[PDB]
């Protein structure tokens, strides 16, 4: 019989009711350089079943409580047993209070403690963040509880289902602002023991999870809006960022987004206020703390003067994502981390819906397809993938919990939920969603609860008919990994499904309860006209006339790629599709014009179509003005460039892409009035960005001319940059590529004086575009100088140099020679040896290069590889795959490009 304090899950014998927590960060170090926080807490809990032990979470806390580590009292007139002893059990992160008698069912108890911890710069629990304002190093205190770190700030029953109300008090320097989940109760009062400090009490939280608590002490200022319903909206940031107006876009979109969600969810925003705060270098990206959402600065702030349209899109979607959680996740909370995919998957889908509401002309909802669907299919088409669902009993330790937060959980989660909403219809999905939120408000759920409420909505109507229960259908998409390729023979209308793997030689060893068969919702378009919807049942092969064609007709499946699968056709149908796109592309929805490209390249990788069929699918692009299909092609061809840009294949490839993109360049040349004014909507701006990128990188003289002229103009007047932020990355790069040390030194100067990270990033990247060996070598010589290149930017810069075909050997020589820097940078910040190894060896595709990677590895004796260990093994494995791919594809691909470049 194992002791309960040696088990990772808490007993269910005691449940929390409410907590008082007072925290006091000390933002001045103790002279040895240690920063601490002090705290005091009282938790009131109810005894459900008799027990003589209290087990509560505690991590890295020292107790200063009088007597034992806690004091234990009865609520009202309840008696309390005496404490035998208190002990900390570090492995399972518990404070354990052994009692001399048993607590009694139905009785409430209050347990008080006093404690302190390090206010470490570790982004965990209550922690410190250091940044610069002019001459001064500033330090603030802030929180990150996600997932199991509330217990690092105060002792608590730190599991998400164990909800309670929280009364937070902050004790802080009197000239700093204190924020938490709720509004402050009133004005701060001076601390009696030292009036240099103030005390800020916050209103009681709703019933809520520990992982969603937040409290922050800083010098931050805000911009504000009061919504019509009295809800106060604030964006918080560094005083200088606020003063420059960088919080305005976030402020602009927040009101509309909250309004969208209240309506979408049929549920009022559950808090009196909304704070969002931009933190410098918040590595977690963003965190949905209820009423006080934290973001890295570059995710929330926006500078219209220097930021591109893609920055704007990042802000509105990141906001919509975190605000989505203020209902789904925070109001109704998944009972355990094994169901994290539902929470993050749901937010990862509806972020597009929320953002679309704020920017209705942007067609943002489309972006889930390239952004999430095809992104996650890359890793879900591997034998090494995993199902969305995990048994709760397999997820116990904080490490196992962290593993829940991956591409599958977020992106496949979003994909399958989007598929679900689509086959139910949004109206029906929303009914079940509202029912679910209403039923479980301030409580906890599993994914089965959502399915049940969606089933109730289906059962209450007669229009939408499903081939099975919602649960049975969704089980196919959640209980087994991967997805099917749907293959259609249009001569017969025969339709088949099989588990899709990119590696046709791969062995799947993870068994499925369903033998890798799905229940698949299949929409289709025939000759541009929508057909009746179809469901492929759990069978390998079926037949339907919907998918049978005449000689001159065509069919296309999975309209707008709402379904989580890829489609293959017989060659005849592929040609009819190709013919349609060649003569009138408008007949096929833009998303599907992209899908044809995405799927065919994947199918070619899997040896299900010849690579030439996939390349044939790019032929229509000379008449394509829209973003997504061009994006599909560029994404699919980046590997081709990577394998071939040092070979005889490259000339014909460059020429072919010049032929394809020249008309688009011409189109935008006129549309933009000689480049003086951007296209109006987001998609058209993205298309222009990619068009100029593709034209210049493939050597279109007109683009090269544009880049030289603008950069010359900039050099003639450094303070007035004539290059629109959307075009900076391309214009900078191509101009530095054309020029020498004059263009290089100018951009270097601009980089050194750059006040803004995103602009500094563009400049750093563009400096790697030089075609002068001596410049790229000198530049490599800077990457390790922290006065010239930030340590956190070093590997990125080397990678950018490696990406330059000329820089490739230079960077590889640099990494080998200076690998004697692992013992200077496994302790001096991470560095990321893993990402650096992958970037520099990315191109390797020959036996000779494999020999060099092996010979470099022959320094196994000492120094090792660190966090890049086995990333080095990944590189050796990938090189082998590349060798095999180039050998199989070189001849066929060379001839295709030659043939189709006029």
């Amino acid at each position: 019989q194992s002791k309960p304090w040696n088990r990772y899950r808490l007993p269910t014998t005691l449940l929390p009711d409410s907590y008082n927590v007072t925290l006091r960060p000390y933002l001045t170090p103790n002279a040895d350089g240690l920063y601490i926080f002090k705290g005091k807490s009282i938790v009131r809990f109810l005894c459900q079943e008799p027990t003589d032990v209290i087990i509560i979470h505690s991590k890295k806390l020292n107790y200063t409580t009088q007597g034992h580590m806690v004091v234990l009292r009865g609520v009202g007139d309840s008696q309390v047993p005496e404490i035998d002893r208190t002990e900390l059990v570090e492995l399972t992160e518990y404070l354990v209070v052994h009692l001399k008698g048993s607590l009694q069912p139905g009785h409430m108890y209050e347990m008080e403690s006093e404690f302190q911890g390090e206010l470490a710069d570790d982004l965990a629990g209550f922690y410190r963040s250091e940044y610069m304002e002019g001459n001064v190093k500033k330090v603030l205190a802030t929180t990150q509880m996600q997932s199991t770190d509330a217990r690092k700030s105060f002792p608590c029953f730190d599991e998400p289902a164990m909800k309670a109300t929280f009364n937070i008090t902050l004790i802080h320097p009197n000239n700093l602002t204190a924020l938490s989940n709720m509004p402050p109760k009133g004005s701060s009062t001076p601390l009696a023991e030292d009036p240099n400090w103030s005390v800020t009490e916050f209103e009681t939280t709703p019933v809520m999870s520990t992982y969603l608590l937040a409290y922050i002490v800083s010098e931050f200022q805000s911009v504000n809006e009061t919504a019509q319903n009295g809800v106060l909206i604030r964006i918080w940031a560094r005083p200088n960022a606020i003063a420059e107006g960088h919080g305005m876009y976030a402020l602009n979109v927040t009101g509309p987004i909250l309004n969208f969600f209240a309506n979408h969810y049929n549920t009022s925003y559950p808090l009196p206020k909304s704070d969002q705060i931009a933190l410098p270098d918040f590595n977690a990206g963003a965190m949905e703390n209820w009423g006080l959402v934290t973001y890295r600065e570059n995710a929330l702030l926006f500078d219209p003067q220097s930021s591109s349209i893609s920055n704007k899109e990042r802000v509105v979607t990141v906001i919509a994502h975190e605000l989505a959680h203020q209902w789904f996740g925070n109001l109704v909370t998944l009972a355990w981390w094994n169901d994290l995919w539902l929470n993050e998957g749901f937010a990862s889908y509806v972020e597009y819906l929320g953002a679309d509401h704020a920017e209705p002309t942007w067609n943002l909802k489309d972006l889930i397809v390239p952004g999430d669907v095809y992104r996650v299919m890359a890793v879900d088409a591997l034998a090494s993938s995993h199902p969305l669902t995990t048994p709760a009993e397999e997820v116990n330790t904080p490490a196992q919990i962290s593993e829940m937060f991956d591409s599958i959980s977020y992106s496949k989660g979003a994909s399958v939920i989007r598929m679900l909403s689509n086959f139910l219809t949004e109206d029906l999905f929303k009914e079940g969603l509202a029912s679910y939120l209403h039923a479980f408000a301030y409580q906890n759920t599993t994914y089965l609860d959502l399915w049940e409420h969606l089933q109730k909505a289906v059962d209450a109507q007669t229009s939408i008919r499903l081939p099975d229960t919602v649960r049975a259908i969704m089980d196919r998409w959640t209980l087994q990994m991967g997805f099917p390729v749907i293959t259609v023979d249009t001569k017969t209308g025969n339709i088949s499904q099989k588990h899709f793997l990119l590696d046709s030689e791969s062995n799947v060893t993870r068994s499925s309860a369903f033998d890798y068969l799905w229940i698949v919702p299949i929409s289709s378009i025939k000759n541009g006209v929508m057909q009746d919807h179809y469901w492929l049942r759990d069978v390998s092969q079926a037949q339907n006339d919907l998918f049978k064609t005449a000689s001159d007709d065509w069919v296309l499946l999975n309209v707008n790629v709402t379904g989580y699968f890829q489609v293959n056709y017989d060659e005849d149908n592929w040609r009819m599709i190709q013919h349609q796109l060649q003569t009138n592309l408008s007949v096929i929805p833009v998303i599907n014009r992209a899908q044809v490209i995405y799927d065919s390249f994947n199918l070619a990788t899997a040896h299900m179509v010849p690579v030439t069929l996939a390349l044939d699918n790019t032929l229509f692009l000379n008449g394509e003005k829209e973003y997504m299909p061009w994006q599909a092609a560029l994404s699919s061809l980046s590997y081709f460039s990577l394998m071939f840009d040092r070979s005889e294949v490259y000339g014909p490839m460059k020429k072919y892409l010049r032929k394809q993109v020249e008309p688009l360049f011409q189109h935008f040349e006129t549309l933009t009035k000689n480049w003086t004014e951007r296209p109006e909507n987001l998609m058209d701006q993205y298309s222009e960005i990619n068009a100029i990128s593709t034209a210049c990188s493939n050597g279109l003289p007109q683009c090269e001319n544009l880049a030289k002229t603008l950069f010359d103009q900039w050099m003639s007047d450094p303070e007035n940059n004539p290059i629109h932020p959307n075009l900076r990355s391309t214009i900078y790069c191509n101009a530095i590529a054309q020029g020498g040390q004059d263009q290089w030194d100018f951009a270097w100067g601009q980089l050194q004086q750059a006040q803004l990270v995103n602009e500094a990033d563009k400049l750093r990247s563009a400096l790697a575009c030089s075609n002068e060996v001596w410049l790229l070598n000198r530049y490599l010589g800077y990457t390790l100088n922290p006065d010239l290149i930030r340590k956190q930017d070093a590997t990125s810069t080397i990678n950018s140099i490696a990406s330059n075909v000329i820089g490739q050997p230079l960077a590889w020589d640099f990494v080998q020679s200076n690998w004697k820097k692992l013992f200077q940078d496994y302790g001096g910040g991470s560095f990321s040896f893993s990402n650096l190894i992958q970037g520099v060896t990315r191109r390797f595709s020959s036996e000779f290069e494999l020999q060099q990677l092996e010979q470099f590895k022959k320094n196994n004796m000492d120094v090792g590889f660190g966090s890049g260990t086995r990333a080095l093994e990944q590189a050796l494995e990938k090189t082998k795959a590349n060798i095999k791919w180039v050998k199989e594809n070189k001849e066929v691909v060379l001839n295709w490009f030659i043939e189709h470049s006029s």
């Binding site: 996600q146 977690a284 990206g285 963003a286 965190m287 949905e288 973001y295 995710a299 990042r314 979607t317 990141v318 994502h321 975190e322 993050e344 990862s348 972020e351 972006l367 390239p370 952004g371 999430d372 095809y374 992104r375 996650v376 890359a378 890793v379 088409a381 937060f405 977020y410 992106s411 990119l502 995405y598 390249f601 994947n602 990788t605 994006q631 599909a632 994404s635 699919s636």
Partner: peptide, 11 residues
Amino acid sequence: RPKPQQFFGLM
């Protein structure tokens, strides 16, 4: 924690 995801992704 925050993920929208960057809008490329394709193997």
